[PDB]
Subunit: 634 residues, 2 copies
């Protein structure tokens, strides 16, 4: 080995025109190699067929051009990060060689090699100072670009998923299907945030880049393997251990040590899916037991039952803390193997290359590159076993959403009562039988016809099929049969409930509930509030406090007689609606209904024997199935 | 510089008997230095006086010995981690010297220095193989020891905080205080998990050790500074830049560069507290609007109002996504400074020591130790500015709990009605005036006395002070005055509500609600269910489904007449309770009450004019303030 000076590894001049063609070449290969694996994952996979049923309409259509145009920049922002990782490795090959040429000039004595080794050190520091700004600039323009995507995804998904909950009265007929969902108030608010925001377990924090995401963190660990496998191939040598001549030992060793140590870490973390799904189910049945106590806080204070409610509230907190203690005991046997494997491989490229260095074969430059390339194809093939604890919690957020999407298509396939429009203006019903979900009987087939000015009173016992007749004519009860003829329209058939109801907003929205607040003028709302003796509420039409705990139940049944004078229906049904009003105010509220609307089919359910002298006919339920119709004898 | 062989830095023999005395010496200093800073933080701090009001009783008392004994091991588990970080730095000082003595024997020619440098390399690999098992063993016995602490803290805190919510009827009188809390169903379930589990922002995951916690991550960054400052002190030299002779440049430089760059990163992240407090408030008023729609899903289906409810549900989702977009825009200007500062300091110990190395002053061993000690007192003084985004979200979880603890001591200071026990058996009330929170009047002072067999009917209009008389005798209405004399006891004065109520559990718990299910024998519950005509419910006493949506409101008022035959009260009040029952079943339910309990003061509120011929006296509210008392006629 004669006197050789210092020569660089890569020509640092013409390094920017060469790293502008490699990026443009590696982008178009990966753009058609990524789009051929997701097609193979939409089929042939049980968890890939449930990802596409939820969010299909966001990626296809005419309004899905700005989605792919923003998804195509995040691949350039990963290829540009692999290229800098290679150019950082090319510089430590120069610095450790320049630090070796300076030591062989001091001990030898000459000053030609030393002056060529000193000048090679101050060159390989100025290259580090230019490639340290392009790292900060690339990192900080990558947090901002990936937080504008998982916001606009979440805003679309939680708006599309709610129209699917209240489309065909599917929020009420989900109690009769065979397999029922637990609570759909949590899978819309919280679970969409875990589903859309990349890494599983937690909702997103405003510092999550693209390296903490289970898609773009996996397509980096393939380009980082393909781009590094041409450096480790021509830096290893023949190894003899048992008389077997292995040609490239350090390259075939790392592909055996990972494949064996991976398949043991898939049978340890196998039951880790059904322990992270039960942690969201038992934690969302504890919060519902506290909200139900909040809006019923007067009846608990009346009964003084604050000690029985301290037991049915503690019976739901025991299995949410007994399940967590075995979720902890499984994530130590899983995290104790992936660290004990990765720790006993770090002195391996220092004990194979070290006998080849003390003899004159290599020159201390390629030891500092073998120590980097071996610790970078090992940190990229160990992505599929280091991040299995954050994928098994992401697979338990597709099941919860797929249950909600599945249990609304079986909520619109249950049978109901067929409804047809009338001939001119009539309410006639041909044959109706109503059953009980256990299989009993309530009402035999009956035939009723009303005319344009008729009336009807339905009377009977206290617990025999009286409200569930009206729950069948409103298309809400599945166990029924028959047909109905109605004066159909938009709001030309009004129903009223037995227990009163008030919405959330201001009092102007409480007064006219089925219509909007802007479709009713201001000048007509202050006169109809004085016919129902609701005088002192002419102010306070712009307040915000909750009216379910302020308005007494004798004033929530006079508001319900003001929603019937503004909508102007034709065939209004009503049950109850005089449970709190006394006689004198009850008789004064039906004369107004007969004097304002001159021709409406009024059907009213009642209990007190002072309303039968106002209507014309009468239907009586004997209980057990038998009905009896008779005209008002008067 | 003559021929010198290889000598180690530290005597590796007698390294275990020396590192067993240093740990025992550094434990007792830190045990009394840590306990003198927390005392200075309990006072003199606005966020330290609110931490002690919540969780005081857990750390003091006689049952708080096993808390400190488990808190004292987690300090040993940090001192044992600083000592290994020093012993790892002592080994790179040997390996880089042994790699330098081998290169000065090849170029010089002799084989005495080379054979002494080769043998010094294979010694400093076997020391790395022993100190790599004590790292994995220490890390994996540190996850398990800190997950047994923040479980037993959470189980105690969420049980102590709930007894403070329903102690003195404080769940109802929190609506009348001056500054009201938002929703206390979220600060008990979720916010205790963020408060107890160390690092802020997210609830704990089962892999959080002790280095991801805002207390034991701060007491490591002081012992790591004190233990490393004696190595960097005697490795730096005199630097001349502008004619000023600085004695120790590399030590006084790093204490100036951090103190300046810290105080700029405290005025950028200053409004980051009130943006992480509003993210939990606007996200917990959206979920409440979905639960209220779930248990009232019949009245929305009757009215067909699924389009007005799609607007009052979208008016609460706009400000939860408009606030997040400015939480993202602040966490980039804060994270863009702490990375741009820490990146431009990494080539600094390589450009000051490099002219001193090419001349014969140092020997390449202490460059590899200056590169480590400078990058370890810089990574420990930068703990108070790198982790300010996770502390400003922890300071917004003490305000939410302190509001809940504060708003229950002002909920028991409001005035009420004084109650005294009776003389023998009587209900007499002296003077009672009842007001309205706006300042109006409902009831003038009145004086009523009942005897051991008397009765009373309270009648009046539909909206004039009828239920709020009974909301004052039950100690629930703050705007009242006067006194009351009652036959006091445990359950010798029963109240009933206007709207019925059913608890959560099985039907055996629904039937006997104020008593427990075990305090009533089985043989007496099946006879009293047949006197109230509730015959077919003799089975299904062991089911689980919700009975608020199954039992009709005509059968939730006959169950309420079976809670009055098992408790056996003396002076029972009741309002409503016959809104759905017809005549014939109403008259048959009062004869049973008079025939089973032979002497009870029965006070009943009613509307229908067929109940006044059963009682004896009568009180009538004229409306506006005037009352009128008269004995029952014929
Ligand atoms: C599209 C983005 C591309 C991503 C990858 C980024 C590639 C660019 C990063 C490395 C740039 C290296 O920048 C380097 O600077 C040093 C000076 O400090 C210069 O280095 C060169 O200087 C002069 C030419 O000017 C030569 O005679 C000399 O032999 C050589 O040392 C070159 O200008 C360039 O080789
Ligand atoms: C940063 C967070 C992570 C981001 C997550 C990004 C996920 C992107 C996944 C897209 C993968 C492509 O998904 C693939 O799209 C093509 C269209 O090009 C579909 O091809 C076709 O699908 C069905 C097949 O019946 C057709 O009805 C549809 O018209 C058509 O799109 C494939 O069915 C789908 O599997
Ligand atoms: C992570 C993968 C990154 C590689 C992909 C980057 C794309 C770079 C160019 C962006 C242009 C995207 O533009 C988009 O292309 C896809 C083809 O896939 C077209 O096709 C897409 O929509 C059409 C309907 O419009 C569907 O029938 C089809 O199933 C769907 O794949 C879109 O109509 C077009 O809007
Ligand atoms: C999810 C799967 C995604 C698949 C991703 C596939 C990425 C492909 C890696 C880049 C391939 C580029 O192919 C390469 O191009 C450059 C420019 O000529 C040349 O090779 C260049 O990159 C390779 C890295 O592979 C270097 O080892 C080599 O020093 C360099 O000159 C060769 O011609 C060819 O090996
Ligand atoms: C429609 C396209 C859907 C793409 C949505 C985005 C997902 C991005 C890819 C997920 C990354 C997971 O990374 C790795 O994936 C492979 C499968 O490829 C999983 O490997 C396994 O997954 C599960 C869990 O055992 C097995 O049922 C499956 O048979 C096997 O493929 C690894 O457990 C996971 O660590
Ligand atoms: C309480 C826990 C303490 C925490 C800190 C941990 C301290 C222990 C870690 C370092 C232990 C070093 O272990 C080291 O092993 C090498 C062999 O490989 C030995 O090293 C020594 O060997 C023999 C003595 O046996 C000597 O003549 C020789 O000069 C020297 O190289 C010593 O046995 C010990 O110095
Ligand atoms: C891993 C998660 C993080 C773990 C968090 C650990 C926090 C531990 C904090 C404890 C600090 C000591 O806190 C200090 O205790 C001493 C008792 O020794 C108290 O000293 C005294 O406090 C008040 C003073 O009026 C007395 O009523 C009380 O009897 C007494 O304890 C101090 O008031 C308190 O400030
Ligand atoms: C993070 C700090 C770690 C350093 C502390 C490690 C302690 C090592 C020995 C553990 C013994 C602890 O034992 C505990 O000591 C404290 C003194 O602080 C005593 O004092 C504690 O409780 C008593 C009442 O019992 C209170 O009046 C007092 O305010 C409180 O500090 C406890 O009564 C005792 O149970
Ligand atoms: C929240 C605040 C907590 C404060 C924590 C305070 C920790 C104190 C650090 C350890 C102090 C030990 O004090 C030290 O003891 C050992 C054993 O003799 C000796 O010094 C030993 O440790 C020091 C580290 O400081 C080394 O630089 C030295 O090589 C070693 O011999 C000296 O005598 C004395 O400097
Ligand atoms: C009763 C004992 C309470 C101990 C509970 C456990 C808390 C553990 C210590 C908190 C760690 C925070 O670490 C660092 O603390 C210092 C104060 O010491 C904070 O410094 C500042 O805090 C806030 C925020 O500006 C200022 O109002 C305060 O004036 C100042 O001290 C830093 O913002 C924080 O990064
Ligand atoms: N915060 C409030 N809580 C209760 N009532 C309030 C409140 N603010 C104002 N009020 C009025 O106070 C009165 C109390 O009504 P209340 O005496 O309970 O009715 P009632 O006579 O029991 N009704 P009814 O059941 O129909 O016979 C009503 O006029 C309310 O509108
Ligand atoms: N899932 C169910 N939903 C409704 N009713 C059910 C259900 N399962 C059983 N039933 C019984 O079916 C009957 C329906 O009661 P319903 O006809 O609504 O009462 P009502 O006659 O309106 N009562 P009332 O208001 O006092 O006059 C009752 O006997 C219920 O106990
Ligand atoms: Mg009914
Ligand atoms: Mg009332």
């Amino acid at each position: 080995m004669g006197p050789k000076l210092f020569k660089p590894s890569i020509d640092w001049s013409r390094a920017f025109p060469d790293s502008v063609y490699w990026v443009g070449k590696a982008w178009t290969i990966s753009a058609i190699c990524v789009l051929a694996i997701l097609v193979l994952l939409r089929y042939l996979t049980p968890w890939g067929r449930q990802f596409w049923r939820i969010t299909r309409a966001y990626f296809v259509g005419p309004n899905s051009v700005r989605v792919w145009l923003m998804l195509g920049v995040l691949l350039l922002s990963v290829v540009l990060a692999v290229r800098l990782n290679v150019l950082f490795s090319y510089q430590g090959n120069d610095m450790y060689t320049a630090l070796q040429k300076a030591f062989e000039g001091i001990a030898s004595g000459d000053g030609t090699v030393k002056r060529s080794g000193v000048r090679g050190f101050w060159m390989s520091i100025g290259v580090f100072s230019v490639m340290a700004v392009l790292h900060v600039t690339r990192v900080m323009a990558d947090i901002y670009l990936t937080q504008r995507f998982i916001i606009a995804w979440r805003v679309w998904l939680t708006h599309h998923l709610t129209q699917d909950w209240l489309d065909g009265r599917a929020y009420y007929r989900d109690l009769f299907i065979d397999e029922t969902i637990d609570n759909p108030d949590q899978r819309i608010q919280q679970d969409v945030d875990i589903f859309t925001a990349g890494a599983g377990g937690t909702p997103n924090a405003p510092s999550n880049g693209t390296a903490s995401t289970l898609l773009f963190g996996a397509v980096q660990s393939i380009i980082s393997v393909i781009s590094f496998t041409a450096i480790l191939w021509n830096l290893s040598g023949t190894l003899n251990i048992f008389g077997v001549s292995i040609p490239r030992a350090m390259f075939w060793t790392v592909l055996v040590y990972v494949f064996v140590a991976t398949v043991i870490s898939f049978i340890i973390g196998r039951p880790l899916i059904w322990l992270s799904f039960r942690n969201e189910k038992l934690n969302a049945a504890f919060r519902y037991a506290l909200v139900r106590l909040r809006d019923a806080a007067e009846a608990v204070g009346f009964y003084r039952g604050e000690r029985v409610e301290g037991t049915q509230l503690q019976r739901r907190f025991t299995p949410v803390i007994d399940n967590y203690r075995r979720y902890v005991r499984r994530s130590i046997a899983f995290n104790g193997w992936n660290l004990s494997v990765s720790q006993t491989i770090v002195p391996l490229p220092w004990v194979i290359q070290a006998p080849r260095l003390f003899a004159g074969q290599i020159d201390f430059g390629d030891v500092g590159q073998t120590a980097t390339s071996f610790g970078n194809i090992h940190d990229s093939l160990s992505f599929f076993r280091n991040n299995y604890d954050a994928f098994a919690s992401f697979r338990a957020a597709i099941i919860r959403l797929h249950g909600l999407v599945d249990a609304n298509e079986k909520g619109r396939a249950l049978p109901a009562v067929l409804t047809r429009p009338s001939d001119d203006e009539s309410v006639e019903l041909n044959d109706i039988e109503v059953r009980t979900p256990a299989g009993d009987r309530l009402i035999d087939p009956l035939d009723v016809r009303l005319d344009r000015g008729g009336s009807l009173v339905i009377t009977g016992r206290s617990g025999a099929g009286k409200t569930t007749l009206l729950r069948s004519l409103a298309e809400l009860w599945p166990y029924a049969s028959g047909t109905l003829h109605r004066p159909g329209g938009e709001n030309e058939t009004m129903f009223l409930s037995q227990l009163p109801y008030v919405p959330l907003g201001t009092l102007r929205d409480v007064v006219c509930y089925p219509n909007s607040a802007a479709a009713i003028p201001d000048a007509t709302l202050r006169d109809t509030l004085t016919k129902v003796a609701l005088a002192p509420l002419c102010d306070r039409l712009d307040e915000e406090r909750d009216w379910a705990k302020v308005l007494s139940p004798g004033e929530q049944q006079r508001v319900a007689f003001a929603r019937i004078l503004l909508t102007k229906p034709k065939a209004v049904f009503l049950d109850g609606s005089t449970s709190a009003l006394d006689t004198g105010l009850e008789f004064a509220l039906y004369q107004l209904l007969r004097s304002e609307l001159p021709d409406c089919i009024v059907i009213s359910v009642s209990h007190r024997p002072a309303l039968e002298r106002l209507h014309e006919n009468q239907l009586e339920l004997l209980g057990g199935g038998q009905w009896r119709l008779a005209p008002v004898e008067a």
